Structure 1
Amino acid sequence: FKMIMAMTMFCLYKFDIESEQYKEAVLTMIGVLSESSDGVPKLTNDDLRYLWDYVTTKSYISALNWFKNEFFVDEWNIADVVANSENNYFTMASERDVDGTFKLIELAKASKESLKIIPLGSIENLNYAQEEISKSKIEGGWILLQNIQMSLSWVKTYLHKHVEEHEKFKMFMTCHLTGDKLPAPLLQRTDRVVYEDIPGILDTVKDLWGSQFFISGVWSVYCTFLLSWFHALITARTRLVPHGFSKKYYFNDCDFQFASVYLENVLATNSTNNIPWAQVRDHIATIVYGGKIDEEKDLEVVAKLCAHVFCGSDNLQIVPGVRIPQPLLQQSEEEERARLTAILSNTIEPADSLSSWLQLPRESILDYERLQAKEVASSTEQLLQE
């Protein structure tokens, strides 16, 4: 929607400052973008020549961010939008597959402001939130209410009655876009904001490594490493809505918790040389990660990914760039953690990771960007008719 609003504003400006040949060039370029029309525009400048070279190269989003960079000369982050705010209430929003708490924590560390993480819940959680908002209305601070969608009615009574001023007093909400409809007074009496995490596959692996703290020997840590890598791989593959999976599932930290407990209990009862890789493989593919999956093709895909990740052969290639040697007999867990962190930092992400870190043919991801280009072009075409 950001790109769509950007493109509509660009069309509104350049359709009135410039002549009609520019308008015809824009129309035919959007038509080729939607794969609806065929025709060479009445070429004369250099920018439109670059656009034509882009669309002949079939690099759609390249041309789209070229639009964004060539016309617009600046961008706004969360820091700028929270810097200049007449109001003091911000309802941060995201999806359920991407967290937004750690960005707020990093902002609070940068802004040297006291942030209180207050996940709602039972009456005890409601009393905790009430005490925290009373404290931060008495002496200031920053308040985060994490995942308020689960207490929509509690929000609709308590927060609405509270809003219907202390210096340096700010608070933050958190809601999921694919959830329940929020009331109109809550939406319009705030500075709306939404955060999109770039899919940093190595970055989320580093964050998951730092979030944890590691237990049965070197095999426990090595299996935790492999499981974290598999969770990151499947979380990256679930971003591709029409190609990676037939439906948009949402795996989270609880699934990793259950998979970790299962692996720990398997390795605890079996520390032998022949670790039952097939048993943990099927158990994860059908029960842990296969719990929410019903279509046969999705099960086959998750089974293939598990067979590639948890094979446990002599040498393993999680991505075509790096390899994982297993810990040997006379190894200790601290140096093993250091070695795995080193082999994580040794890894450099190639630019084609979305088609090489997830085992997908390149034609599939070109098809995905073709579909996204078609839908954004169709949205622009519908919006420009008024």
Structure 2
Amino acid sequence: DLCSRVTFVNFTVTRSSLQSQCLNEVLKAERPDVDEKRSDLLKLQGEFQLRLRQLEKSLLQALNEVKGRILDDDTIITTLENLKREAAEVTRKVEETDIVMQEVETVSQQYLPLSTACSSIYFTMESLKQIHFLYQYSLQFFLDIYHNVLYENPNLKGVTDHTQRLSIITKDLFQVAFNRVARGMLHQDHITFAMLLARIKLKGTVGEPTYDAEFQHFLRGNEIVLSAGSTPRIQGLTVEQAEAVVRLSCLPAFKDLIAKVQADEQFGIWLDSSSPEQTVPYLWSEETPATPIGQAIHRLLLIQAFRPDRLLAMAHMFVSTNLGESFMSIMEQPLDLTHIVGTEVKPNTPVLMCSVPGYDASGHVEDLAAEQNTQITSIAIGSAEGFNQADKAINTAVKSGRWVMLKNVHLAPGWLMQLEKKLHSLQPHACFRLFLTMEINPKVPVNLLRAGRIFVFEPPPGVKANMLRTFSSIPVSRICKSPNERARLYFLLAWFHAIIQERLRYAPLGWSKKYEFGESDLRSACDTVDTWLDDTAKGRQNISPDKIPWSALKTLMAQSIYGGRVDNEFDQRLLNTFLERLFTTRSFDSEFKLACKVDGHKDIQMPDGIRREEFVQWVELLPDTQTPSWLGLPNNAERVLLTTQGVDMISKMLKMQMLEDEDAWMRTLHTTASNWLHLIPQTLSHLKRTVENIKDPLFRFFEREVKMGAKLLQDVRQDLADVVQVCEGKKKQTNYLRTLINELVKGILPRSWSHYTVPAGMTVIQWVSDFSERIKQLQNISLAAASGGAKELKNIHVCLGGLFVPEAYITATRQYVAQANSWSLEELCLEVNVTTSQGATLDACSFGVTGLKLQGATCNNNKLSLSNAISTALPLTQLRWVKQTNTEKKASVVTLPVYLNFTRADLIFTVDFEIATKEDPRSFYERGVAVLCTE
């Protein structure tokens, strides 16, 4: 009804609308001669005719009232000549309704790719919301960028050629857009935005091909599935690289890659090189000498296939060779806030700035105000009196031209909403800037993010920077207070805090989860050390290193300060080993090694000074190089983090391709539904229940699991049938059906399908693949059990990864052997025996387990050793339940957690392994050795 009773007007923005807007703006702005010629084209109409008829009306008004005086001074003939000239002029304009139109059409055709690039850049900027909730950019923001480029360009000075002006304005537009967007953007996404801008400019430029197939493979090369057993073995490279080559071989220019890499001899020194992106070899097949951009794309595909940890570096290189080597150089520099706040900030737009939790940005603006000699008032937003103080401060400063601090405004989204509503309808002073500081939270209003000049402040990484920040935050007098060993204890605590806080960055290897080891924990640890040192010293100037309460500090920092948030026993054990290694009397010796096996050969010797200034000097003299061996992590942790960032960037830019490119979803849904119904299995068979098989624990677990799994399979098959019925159009949908269809289209995992344990943030394609693997395993075990009975079920090898609750599987086998040997469950203990042999003889108490993986170590003859491999594929693992005898704990025994997946969020059971060499169990815990049921 409301549709029918009103008429609709759409002042909406789109490709064609913004294209015409940018074309009109650029023609009105930059080109003067055809600017005047095209304004004269708008003057082809009757503006002069209206002026002449107004003059004629005035003359007619001055015509009737006459008594013989119209022959006054022969001045009317001048107006007659003027009107005849105007009539001839508009007649000539009418006659020239084709030549001038053709000229302005050619001139506008000279400026078509520029406006296409403008439209593409603005649409990417609008599509930036889906990457992260913080990225909210507006049409007014893009027009501010465009006006700043077109009008206030310092490059355009002294240039008169129109082609040179076009090239300068295009380069400046791209650079200024990237700078302004990336200033308010996290560091992990600068490369993503630069890659999008490089793609936009590559599409908009002439003389270069599309590389559409190359881009499609670069984005969704992992979406295609390879047949099992179809990957051959190639020397000089690993299994995963072999399937990467197999996936890459589908391209027409990459057919002979296997032959080339087999015939290549110098491949090892490049594959093991530190920077393969500098000396990437020649492997792409071509018929003509390719462009630098084309060879950059080909080598980028090669790097992504071969060494994914260098994907970030090679994407940086491609952006450099596509848009300029100095394109990203602005971001690798300190912020020039002065120019931004003085020029590019509108008086009614508040300077919005954001930070990660635990980090502030008020000091930057305090320094800016100090160097700009402008008075600014600090107001803390935490209560109603704070609200009133903010109100009075802003209504004073809007007239007085001052600056207003509004600290931690993320706690009041309603106040932020009404404050933005106030800011929409005021007239500000020429020097009034409102600085809003808050942490990155999703509760900040989206329209407030849209209507603000956003900024992102992050703490730089590196242990040197972390300890410098810690020593700057800690006042000098607190460390300077007696006794003199307090400085050494504070240095130890700061090193430990930096070690754990930057061990967070390498999750899940550094910790099982990302705890919040922020500034409050640091303050609590400092207060604990202060109190215990005061109690021990009792005002003495010097105390012995042995009399320090090492046990008190270790236990308190392990259980109360840092161990309070630690919900994992193994992370608690790692914290315990850190504290035992660091907080001890041996630390005060001159020969104490603060980090052993750094870079494999050297050690970070602990500074011998007894002063805060000496410790700060040692921190400032720390080498800028840093490896995970500084933290205790293995040296492959940086490569793992880099390839995680690479796949994250690939996924983020794939979100851009499926949303910004819409020239639909039903057509792809047909193929996806048919393919899923293809590779998903047909049906499963239940196991027959007998009075003798009722005592089988795996039969009981099979009954429960296969009841709920037959429910899940019938739901999945029926929902896929419903999806393809909607695809063919003869079936409608309910709310549940349309939400499921939308989730399947967007790739979000169906919640009703997902009620068993799966890794977080995982894709429906991988869910279909590993769920079909689980169903295949279930079909195999059902067929074997039905064919043979329950006697061979003890000897059947079961993979822990394919089981739904392998914890229940462990309980099932322990109660099975307990029932077999008529023993209490407490009188049973687990012993692990990794066997490299295939199908070894199994005892009555031995079981078969496959699919296990070992992280950060290697297993040889049931004895572990430190290894530099990321993950080792364990062979058939044996689970033996021996009686729990009164056996003492060996000095070379280690308990390893067995997490189900790589996220290490769930725990199943623990194993007991020996040590081959005399490697420290503390070193094993520091490296973070764990067992994974599936990779």
TM-score (norm 1): 0.84
Q: Which residue of 1 aligns with 2:201?
A: 13
2:564 aligned with 1:291, yes or no? Answer: yes
1:43-54 alignment to 2 at 5 Å? 43=286, 44-46=290-292, 47-48=295-296, 51=300, 54=303
- Report if aligned partners of 2:219, 2:654 keep a CA contact under 8 Å in 1: yes
- Report if aligned partners of 2:300, 2:315 keep a CA contact under 8 Å in 1: no
Give the alignment partner of residue 619 of structure 2, picking from 329, 344, 351. 344
Aligned-partner SS, 1:374: helix
**1:45 CA displacement:** 4.6
Tell me, in whole angstroms, the C-alpha distance in 1 between the residues paired with 2:650 and 2:447.
33
**1:264 CA displacement:** 0.6
Tell me, in whole angstroms, the C-alpha distance in 2 between the residues paired with 1:180 and 1:384.
24
- Report if aligned partners of 1:33, 1:374 keep a CA contact under 8 Å in 2: no
Q: Which deviations, in whole Å up to 9, do the C-alpha atoms of 1:24-63 show, x marking residues without a partner?
A: 3444444569969323354545552654675545422211
Tell me, in whole angstroms, the C-alpha distance in 1 between the residues paired with 2:536 and 2:563.
24
AA paired with 1:118?
I
Give the alignment partner of residue 149 of structure 1, picking from 385, 410, 414. 410
Give the alignment partner of residue 173 of structure 1, picking from 423, 429, 436. 436
Q: Which deviations, in whole Å up to 9, do the C-alpha atoms of 1:120-175 show, x marking residues without a partner?
A: 21334334433433443342332232211223344444564465522211111122
AA paired with 1:66?
M
Q: Which residue of 2 aligns with 1:257?
A: 523
Q: Which residue of 2 aligns with 1:118?
A: 379
Bigger mean CA offset, 114-123 vs 368-377: 114-123
**1:363 CA displacement:** 2.0
Tell me, in whole angstroms, the C-alpha distance in 1 between the residues paired with 2:370 and 2:302.
45
- Report if aligned partners of 1:222, 1:326 keep a CA contact under 8 Å in 2: no
- Report if aligned partners of 1:118, 1:144 keep a CA contact under 8 Å in 2: yes
Q: Which residue of 2 aligns with 1:323?
A: 605
Aligned-partner SS, 2:353: strand
Note closer, same or farther for the CA distance 1:166–1:383 as it changes in structure 2 (3 Å cut): closer
Note closer, same or farther for the CA distance 1:52–1:189 as it changes in structure 2 (3 Å cut): closer
Tell me, in whole angstroms, the C-alpha distance in 2 between the residues paired with 1:19 and 1:101.
47
1:1-386 alignment to 2 at 5 Å? 1-15=189-203, 17=205, 19-20=208-209, 22-30=211-219, 37-39=247-249, 40=254, 41-43=284-286, 44-46=290-292, 47-48=295-296, 51=300, 54-55=303-304, 56-58=306-308, 59-73=310-324, 74=327, 75=330, 77=335, 79=337, 81-82=340-341, 83-86=343-346, 87-157=348-418, 160-161=421-422, 163-164=424-425, 165-177=428-440, 179-211=441-473, 212-213=475-476, 214=479, 215-271=481-537, 272-273=543-544, 274=546, 275-313=548-586, 314=589, 315-319=591-595, 320=598, 322-325=604-607, 336-350=611-625, 352-353=626-627, 355-385=628-658, 386=661
**1:325 CA displacement:** 4.4
Aligned-partner SS, 2:455: strand
AA paired with 2:213?
E
Q: Which deviations, in whole Å up to 9, do the C-alpha atoms of 1:219-240 show, x marking residues without a partner?
A: 2222122212222222222233
Aligned-partner SS, 2:352: strand
**1:193 CA displacement:** 2.3
**1:217 CA displacement:** 1.2
Note closer, same or farther for the CA distance 1:60–1:180 as it changes in structure 2 (3 Å cut): closer
Bigger mean CA offset, 242-251 vs 263-272: 242-251
Q: Which deviations, in whole Å up to 9, do the C-alpha atoms of 1:201-256 show, x marking residues without a partner?
A: 32232233233223331122221222122222222222334432332322322221
RMSD: 3.1
5+ long unaligned stretches in structure 2 = 1-188, 224-243, 255-283, 538-542, 662-935
Tell me, in whole angstroms, the C-alpha distance in 1 between the residues paired with 2:593 and 2:412.
44
Q: Please identify the structure whose Cα radius of gyration is greater.
A: 2
Tell me, in whole angstroms, the C-alpha distance in 2 between the residues paired with 1:382 and 1:123.
42
AA paired with 2:401?
G
Q: Which deviations, in whole Å up to 9, do the C-alpha atoms of 1:299-343 show, x marking residues without a partner?
A: 233333333332442343334454324667xxxxxxx12222222
AA paired with 1:380?
M
Aligned-partner SS, 1:192: coil
Aligned-partner SS, 2:648: helix
- Report if aligned partners of 1:94, 1:194 keep a CA contact under 8 Å in 2: yes
- Report if aligned partners of 1:226, 1:310 keep a CA contact under 8 Å in 2: yes
Q: Percent of counterpart pairs with the same letter?
A: 21
Tell me, in whole angstroms, the C-alpha distance in 1 between the residues paired with 2:370 and 2:322.
34
Note closer, same or farther for the CA distance 1:325–1:371 as it changes in structure 2 (3 Å cut): closer
Note closer, same or farther for the CA distance 1:50–1:348 as it changes in structure 2 (3 Å cut): same
**1:19 CA displacement:** 4.8
- Report if aligned partners of 1:140, 1:166 keep a CA contact under 8 Å in 2: yes
Tell me, in whole angstroms, the C-alpha distance in 2 between the residues paired with 1:106 and 1:201.
25
Q: Which residue of 1 aligns with 2:774?
A: none
Q: Which deviations, in whole Å up to 9, do the C-alpha atoms of 1:94-134 show, x marking residues without a partner?
A: 22143322333343344444444433213343344334334
Tell me, in whole angstroms, the C-alpha distance in 2 between the residues paired with 1:78 and 1:3.
21
Tell me, in whole angstroms, the C-alpha distance in 2 between the residues paired with 1:33 and 1:358.
33
Note closer, same or farther for the CA distance 1:231–1:130 as it changes in structure 2 (3 Å cut): farther
Tell me, in whole angstroms, the C-alpha distance in 1 between the residues paired with 2:594 and 2:396.
49
Note closer, same or farther for the CA distance 1:23–1:159 as it changes in structure 2 (3 Å cut): closer
Tell me, in whole angstroms, the C-alpha distance in 2 between the residues paired with 1:106 and 1:42.
56
**1:266 CA displacement:** 0.7
- Report if aligned partners of 1:93, 1:175 keep a CA contact under 8 Å in 2: yes
Tell me, in whole angstroms, the C-alpha distance in 1 between the residues paired with 2:291 and 2:580.
53
Q: Which deviations, in whole Å up to 9, do the C-alpha atoms of 1:1-25 show, x marking residues without a partner?
A: 4333332332233245355473334
AA paired with 2:444?
L
**1:293 CA displacement:** 1.9
- Report if aligned partners of 2:609, 2:615 keep a CA contact under 8 Å in 1: no
Tell me, in whole angstroms, the C-alpha distance in 2 between the residues paired with 1:13 and 1:140.
41
Bigger mean CA offset, 366-375 vs 244-253: 244-253
TM-score (norm 2): 0.37
Which has the higher relative contact order, 1 or 2, with Cα contacts under 8 A spaced 6 or more apart?
1
- Report if aligned partners of 2:311, 2:646 keep a CA contact under 8 Å in 1: yes
Note closer, same or farther for the CA distance 1:158–1:371 as it changes in structure 2 (3 Å cut): closer
Bigger mean CA offset, 35-44 vs 228-237: 35-44
Aligned-partner SS, 2:403: strand
- Report if aligned partners of 1:218, 1:327 keep a CA contact under 8 Å in 2: no
Tell me, in whole angstroms, the C-alpha distance in 2 between the residues paired with 1:307 and 1:71.
52
- Report if aligned partners of 2:403, 2:434 keep a CA contact under 8 Å in 1: yes
